[PDB]
């Protein structure tokens, strides 16, 4: 939260003073060409004008949407890595070498093109892709074009990518059956790792939907109370008022979002953290030890 | 457009008319079904025992005391009738009798409808309430009579707009 | 202009309904009166009248459907839409009437001829339940005579 | 809704007035209920069902020869209907609902049953398989108790061969397959040998909980006749009998449950 | 001329309440004569809610009252925007007093089942008849605010 | 113009499916209290707070009628067709997801009480499956009041 | 001009359809729940995992309708029918899609409830499939978002 | 200019469609399982080959959508409408595909479920099923994205 | 002028309808094998045999639909709407004729598998019944090919 | 002008009907005579008389819609609108004869394999129902061969 | 001009209806000749009655369709306008007609024929039913011919 410069559905005063100020418009609407000029960027959260601002909805969409597929790469990664740690552990054939290696480079390029073009476009300030032409440059899955590009050698970059998961697909599934039948069950993995890995990465915009759902539930919230305070500042209204938005935030804010957002946030553990790891099994193991007595 | 302009260039006396006679016709099947609901249960006690008759009797009255109004309510209308000019045929004040007639005959047999539905399935159970005891009819009687309100309800209501109708 | 097609649909309406619903209260009694047979033959014709007596509402059908047709002629008088709506909502509302009546009729006798086999003593019940049946074709008689009565501009 | 007054309600009437006038001389209350009953001939299918009832078991008791002239003595039309041995069991096949299933069930004839136990499991398929054709007619709340009925009927059967049937090749696969919650949960019931285990097995059920209590009475029983007496003993829900409903079996339930209670009466 | 949906909706604001209000107060009914059969005393107070139900026809009805008199052509022009408003105003009164209705003539017909059964849930059953009842109430609210607007 | 005959008709049919999804919840919420209070009395007090949260989409439904009531004022400024129709379609979204939740909630409530005497645990599951249903209804009404919001500017 | 009847009448269908499927889900969930609980206390909370499930579908799809809502500016551009086809397109595919997985939820749901007496290794297997179920809703998701982003860019 | 109107409905009518013949198959699949894994929990996991299966028909219909929404550039030509009704119609064949097969799967995996219960020597008979039910998914995918093809006028 | 919106149509007509036709031909063998899956797995090798007949005709559907599809090249020739209402009613009329014997091949598969289970000597009979609906497949697919080629005789 | 609008359409759906009818007499023949050959397997090659009879509704379905396709060709002459109203209304005669045909030969044949496995003194005899249902369908056959023939009588 | 397009419908019509009423009736002919085969299969020679009424009403129908076709000469006597409605009238009421004669045709013998085995001598009673039934389709196919040329040729 204070990550999101959003305490209580309010705004409140940043580490610094003001990130974006109104271009001119000492009496000039806000939107205008002018818009507002920042003079620099706030550090400890967003800028505060943007979120109670009428352009509050795409910018944080934005933000929101780019944040979740970034945790996603990350979350997809650092499982993917637990493999071969797990395979070291205990001490796995040569199947590591010859399955999760391919598994953990195919989808790790295949989100790499995304994650870099929005890292680009984040970095280079490329406002000629936004959230949308970054999607399109994706989008075209054939040669050619590549007008709007901001990637130097996104061109054959784009190329590369595409011969290295085609190529991909085979490596993740024959080795361990080459292996099996050098020595002397893929069917589960075959198929199945392919669309998972697609439904994982898709799965990640539940934690900005959850967000955005949150946010939008505080602002109504707080909304609603500031109607209150404001033309019905008699006492009575005021003492009601408060009570409801007390009533509300115990109800939605309190326990109904915290539950889903728990909720959500096992599912995404479960669904891909643990997809490249655990493997399921086992039992626990438990002495006499005064179990029922204790 | 064109579609549009026909629409609103339909007859209003012909809407008119046909919200009067549905008003009677609406009543008077809404009562009838009432009847038979209670006459089937009166029938039944009376197999049963013959002592109830007129315990029995109230409902079919009650049921056709809403073909009774009805009957009025079409009486009126009839009368809210007019000569209904050539020149004055599409105008303004033709329109809105037509559209109020219609409106009133149309909420008349509605409710007639409901009030003739209830009253009917209210005597079809005290009939039997009475074969199973004599002591609760007086309840029965008195719910049936309440229920009854709705058609006196429509009623007021069709007659109260039945002073919309200015046609020349 | 078809205001005589309008009327002369409403009195085929006035005919067709009102017969409908003679057609189906008599089968419903006769029926009930063929069921009653096997128990009691004596008792056969003591309700066979009641039973046909849906043929009272297809006269009342009939005599309506005669009286629209008797009222519209281009020799009278050029009647217009005014006139042939009036006769075929008065048809119309005749019709129904006598349809809701003949139903409810055809249900009562079906009732009253096992009832009377029951006990002897509901024939004057069954016959004061059959008179307050009819009632509300008596009402919609009259109700179809207002009307067709104003038709006549 | 409307339904009941376009048809049936006369019927409905008479038999609501006759179930409550209602409270040798129980062969005698027998017959009157029989041909009050009779004499009320929608409504003909749930009545055909309702004589079928019985009708399985008068079936069954007629399938025997082996003095089988004696069942004329027990002619009531309540459920010894002439109209409802492999040879003549072909020709009763008809005109019965069970009685087509039971020709494929039970085409060993005595073979399959057997007067000392087969017979009692013939008698509990063609339960079965009446129970099943009456929930088929669904529409309706008798449906719950139908389902009530059924239950307690395999309920009672599996108590039975868990008693001492065991023996008798009733086994846990019996206790469904021959022994005619309990559509879908009847599981619970194979392992329960003991009066303790058939207390826990009941236990699943909390509606069906404290019903067995001591197991003293009712389950003591055989045949059907352990989680039946639960039935009997839970009739007065029977009793309430709301209106606008089909009753006609409720009234049958409640003239056969008088004709019993008289019977057991007999010399005080 | 639009002045048509304006005297329609007044119609049907009293047609589609009446049309819940009967099926409220017949499946109440219903219940009442069966409890009425065994339970002779219960019977006459459980009548308050066959009662609660006709009141949703009264409320009906006067909200329909209100429409017709709105409804005046010769005393001020009654624009489109009048009658769509109350045309809109009537079809939300009649839809929710429907609703409101059959849910408690579905609520009426199991309580007098329970209190036939167990007389100490009466209390109980009131308590939910009347947060039921309460819907045609806000309906009713509506209905005001809607037919208020019709200023211009 | 036209536009106020679709956007008051999008504010009644608003209320008129909040209180028809209401109702729905609420008649299976008594049916099921009924049944479960008739053999333990003590309980039926718990079992009614599934009525009330059925009900809290009743005032819910009101509060977004009276919403759009207030949102159309011709003697303020023109209200031109693009306000009449998201008016509307602020009224029908609302509406409708009043009428689902309330249906959820009822048949939820129903099953809930009827499995309420069996064990206690059902006074926390169903408070918890009529919360997570609620919670629906929250997100229709949130969605309609940005609906109606976005209403306003028109040009 | 009534390209944005049609834009608004898009998310409004949406944000219903959604929550009409999301309520199914969540009805025939707590059926599910209520039947088992009532034998142990595991289903009170261990399977509960469906109620959140389900509105998690509820809320893809409010939050697909408040970005179909913020897409329309008509003070920032004057929408042509482009933009109003566009966004009835993506509201109605985001409803159907929201109500499919709703339905589909629920059946699972509910099933997975029943089968909670059994075995609990299935347990397992029933997330797995709630999981695969619930892939739908997001795919209706993105292909919203797909629409969406290509709706604006209308000539 | 009413090209856009048709051919992103017909985008939309294929997405819709593909998830609901998805969603047919995927509750009669889940219903198998479940019912397989409380019979025999060993073979639970194994037996998720339809209901994996059916999420086969939602990524196809997924990329349709995706390929016609790419095939609308009003920018890069104007959008006649020749284009637009091909575009609607290729999504409606494919969405209808989808459907078909997706509620054909579902009574496959309803029937295999109980078959592999009974006896687990059927499953090649079942994938073998599935995967002939599934060749139709893969024509109307084809068939779509041939129809869809032809967007140069 | 319109003519290529009745051609799409006729083409997605009939290939929805041989898929429909396929589907159920298809689902209708699978319920008829379920059975032979366990009562006789030595024979359910042999029972796949109508599924095959299904996805035959349904590939013969798709055939004719991808015929009728190439047969418009408006570039080539301008498409009248003789063509395009000719092409239309082939579409038709062949996915109306797959579908028909889609759902005849699969309701005789689904005899014919309890057929040869219960004995083996009416697999001869089986295997004719399903070569005399296949022929019904074959006569369609024959006339919407003739009719496709006459769609371009207009001038 | 608009001939094949009309004429193109009946004659698709002609064989459409045709199909459709044998499709469902076809099914039901092959049902029951999977039952008897399961019955009996010597009965199965005799009893496939009614099937193959069946099949004639194909095959006068296929003529009549060659010869509709035939009846129409622009650039031998114009057709009229009659011209094409004619073709049309001769394949509804031939299609909806066919229908009929084929679900009375499908009745009359699922009877007949039960009479025939029953008592095979009246196997041969029964006959005589689908010989009269083949004589009906001949004659709807020449009926539509009558009305098509009238193609060039407009002028 | 657009009569004919009427006319010829109403022909087709005529055809498709008296076939359907044909086929309705004998499918129930054929169930009960069915259902009296093996109990009594010495009467299965003269149960075909039903079987030759459906025949008799096929005939009739298409003798109707092919004399309203006979009519279908463009090459003189302009169509009209009551060319096309008459025949259309005329084509439906003989359809019609058909269809019902048909219907009751097929109960009455199928009733016939599953009351065959019991008093075999009712086959005479049985066959009068019949006739008496199938005397609507000879009374339907006689008023298709009077309204074949009484509003066709009378345009002038």
């Known amino acids: ?59 944080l969409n934005s933000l929101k949407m780019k944040m979740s597929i970034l945790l996603g790469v990350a979350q997809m990664n650092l499982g993917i890595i637990l493999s071969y740690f797990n395979a070291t552990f205990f001490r796995i054939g040569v199947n590591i070498w010859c399955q999760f290696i391919p598994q953990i480079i195919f989808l790790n390029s295949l989100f790499g093109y995304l994650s870099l073009l929005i890292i680009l476009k984040w970095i280079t300030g490329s406002q000629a892709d936004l959230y949308h032409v970054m999607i399109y440059m994706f989008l ?86 500031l109607l209150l ?40 553990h479960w669904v891909e953290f643990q997809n490249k790891f655990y493997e399921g099994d086992g039992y626990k193991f438990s002495p006499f030890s005064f179990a029922l007595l204790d | 457009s064109s579609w549009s302009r026909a629409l609103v260039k339909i007859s ?43 315990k029995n009797l109230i409902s079919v009255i009650f049921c056709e005391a809403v073909a009774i109004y009805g009957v009025i309510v079409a009486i009126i209308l009839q009368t809210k009738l007019e000569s209904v000019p050539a020149s004055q045929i599409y105008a303004p004040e033709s329109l809105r009798a037509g559209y109020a007639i219609f409106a009133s005959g149309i909420i008349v047999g509605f409710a007639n409808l409901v009030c003739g539905l209830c009253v009917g399935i209210i005597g079809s159970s005290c009939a039997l309430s009475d074969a199973q005891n004599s002591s609760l009819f007086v309840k029965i009687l008195v719910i049936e009579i309440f229920g009854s309100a709705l058609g006196l309800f429509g009623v007021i209501v069709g007659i109260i707009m039945s002073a919309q109708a200015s046609w020349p | 202009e078809t205001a005589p097609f309008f009327g002369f649909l409403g009195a085929a309406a006035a005919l067709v309904f009102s017969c409908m619903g003679a057609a189906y209260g008599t089968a419903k009694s006769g029926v009930g009166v063929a069921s009653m047979g096997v128990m009691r033959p004596e008792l056969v014709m003591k309700s066979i009248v009641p039973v046909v007596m849906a043929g009272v509402l297809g006269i009342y059908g009939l005599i309506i459907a005669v009286i629209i047709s008797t009222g519209i002629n281009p020799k009278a008088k050029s009647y217009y839409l005014f006139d042939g709506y009036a006769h075929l909502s008065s048809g119309l509302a005749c019709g129904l009437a006598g349809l809701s009546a003949g139903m409810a009729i055809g249900i009562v006798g079906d009732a009253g001829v096992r009832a009377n086999a029951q006990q002897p003593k509901l024939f004057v019940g069954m016959i004061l339940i059959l008179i307050f ?15 067709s009565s104003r038709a006549g501009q | 809704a409307m339904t009941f007054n376009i048809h049936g309600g006369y019927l409905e009437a008479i038999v609501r007035g006759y179930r409550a006038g209602l409270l040798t001389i129980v062969e005698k209350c027998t017959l009157k209920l029989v041909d009050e009953y009779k004499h009320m001939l929608p409504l003909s299918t749930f009545l055909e069902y309702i004589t079928y009832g019985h009708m399985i078991d008068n079936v069954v008791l007629i399938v025997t020869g082996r003095d089988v002239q004696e069942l004329l003595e027990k002619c009531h039309p309540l459920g010894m209907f002439d109209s409802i041995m492999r040879e003549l069991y072909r020709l009763v096949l008809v005109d019965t609902p069970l009685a087509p299933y039971f020709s494929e069930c039970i085409t060993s004839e005595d073979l399959d049953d057997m007067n000392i136990e087969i017979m009692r499991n013939t008698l509990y398929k063609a339960y079965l398989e009446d129970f099943y054709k009456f929930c088929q007619k669904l529409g309706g709340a008798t449906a719950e108790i ?73 389950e003591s029983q055989m045949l059907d006749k352990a989680f039946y007496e639960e039935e009997v003993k839970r009739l007065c829900l029977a009793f309430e009998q709301q209106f606008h409903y089909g009753v006609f079996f409720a009234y049958m339930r409640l003239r056969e449950q008088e004709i019993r209670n008289l019977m057991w009466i007999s010399e005080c």
């Not at chain 2, 009067?20 to 008077?28: E, L, R």
């Not at chain 4, 139908?146 to 868990?162: G, K, P, Q, Y």
Request: proline share 4%.
């Open chain 4, 146 to 218: 139908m389902s009530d009925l059924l239950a307690f009927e395999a309920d009672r059967r599996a108590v039975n061969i868990t008693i001492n049937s065991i023996g008798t090749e009733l086994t846990r696969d019996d206790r469904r397959k021959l022994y005619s919650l309990y559509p879908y949960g009847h599981e619970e019931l194979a392992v329960c040998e003991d009066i303790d285990q058939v207390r826990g097995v009941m236990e699943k059920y909390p509606p069906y909980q404290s019903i067995f209590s001591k197991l003293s009475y009712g």
């Open chain 1, 140 to 225: 075209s899955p054939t040669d050619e074009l590549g007008d709007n590009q901001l990637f130097p050698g996104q061109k054959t970059a784009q190329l590369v990518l595409l011969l290295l998961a085609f190529v991909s697909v085979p490596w993740m599934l024959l080795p361990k059956p080459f292996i099996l039948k050098m020595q002397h069950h893929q069917m589960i993995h075959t198929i199945e790792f392919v669309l998972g890995a697609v439904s994982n990465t898709a799965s990640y915009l539940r934690l900005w939907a959850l967000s955005l759902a949150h946010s939008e539930l505080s602002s109504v919230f707080y909304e609603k109370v």
């Open chain 1, 229 to 268: 305070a404001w033309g019905y500042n008699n006492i009575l209204i005021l003492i009601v008022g408060i009570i409801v938005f007390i009533f509300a935030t115990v109800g939605v804010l309190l326990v109904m979002e915290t539950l889903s957002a728990f909720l959500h946030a096992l599912r995404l």
């Open chain 1, 1 to 59: 939260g204070l990550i999101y410069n959003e305490f209580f559905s309010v705004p409140f005063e940043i580490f610094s003073h003001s990130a974006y100020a109104c271009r001119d418009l000492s009496c000039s609407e806000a939107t205008t060409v002018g818009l507002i000029k920042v003079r620099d960027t706030y550090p400890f959260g967003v800028d505060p004008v943007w979120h109670g601002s009428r352009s509050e909805l795409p910018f």
């Open chain 2, 12 to 54: 209003p006396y012909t809407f008119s008319a046909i919200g009067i006679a549905v008003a009677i016709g609406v009543s008077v099947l809404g009562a009838a079904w009432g009847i038979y609901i209670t006459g089937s249960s009166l029938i039944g006690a009376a197999i049963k025992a013959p002592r109830i008759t007129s």
């Open chain 3, 133 to 147: 049946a009819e009632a509300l074709a008596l009402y919609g008689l009259i109700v179809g005579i207002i009307l």
